[PDB]
């Protein structure tokens, strides 16, 4: 499993329910034209494999601007972390060290 194959959220119903369904969650809010998002892709693939207990999903902010707005997403990439059926926090930007640290705390 990798950045390429993880679920991409395309609607609010899916977004909300998948949060509720998961004990540990990372949502990568991204834009396809955005260089820091692209930079983070191989880092996410490594994290996806290193933390198989964590569900990673992704969301294209131009394709799903209603989901991005629900999470009040401004900067790309924004990683929104979920824990026990609930969103708990953000890691903003192409920062693999801070991102891995937040994931380890889940």
């Amino acid at each position: 499993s990798s950045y390429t194959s993880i679920t991409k959220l395309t609607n609010l119903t899916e977004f909300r329910n998948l949060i509720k369904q998961n004990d540990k969650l990372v949502i990568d809010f991204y834009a396809t034209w955005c260089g820091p998002c692209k930079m983070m892709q191989p880092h996410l693939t490594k994290l996806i494999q290193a933390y198989p207990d964590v569900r990673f999903v992704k969301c294209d902010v131009d394709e799903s601007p209603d989901i991005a707005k629900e999470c009040e997403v401004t900067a790309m990439p924004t990683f929104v972390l979920g824990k026990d059926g609930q969103l708990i926090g953000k890691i903003i930007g192409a920062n693999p060290t801070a991102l891995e640290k937040g994931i380890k705390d889940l």
Copy 2:
């Protein structure tokens, strides 16, 4: 210089090369029929004068739909910001304050 005299992007490779060459880049994605793009022209002229260390260009989304598509532009004006050889952010709509604040941070 001004809105009228800045480079008008016409090609996808040209757009990519400009992104790589420029430490600081603003692209105005506009449509000629769209009033808010017109309203933003004198604001862009002021910003172009105020930020000589920023390269400003423009792109007609209807004449260059592939470049608009690359940046996922469907609302105009959209201002796409690049820093140090990659695209980093997008400001959507006729919002002079938000635009300057983004430009100021480059």
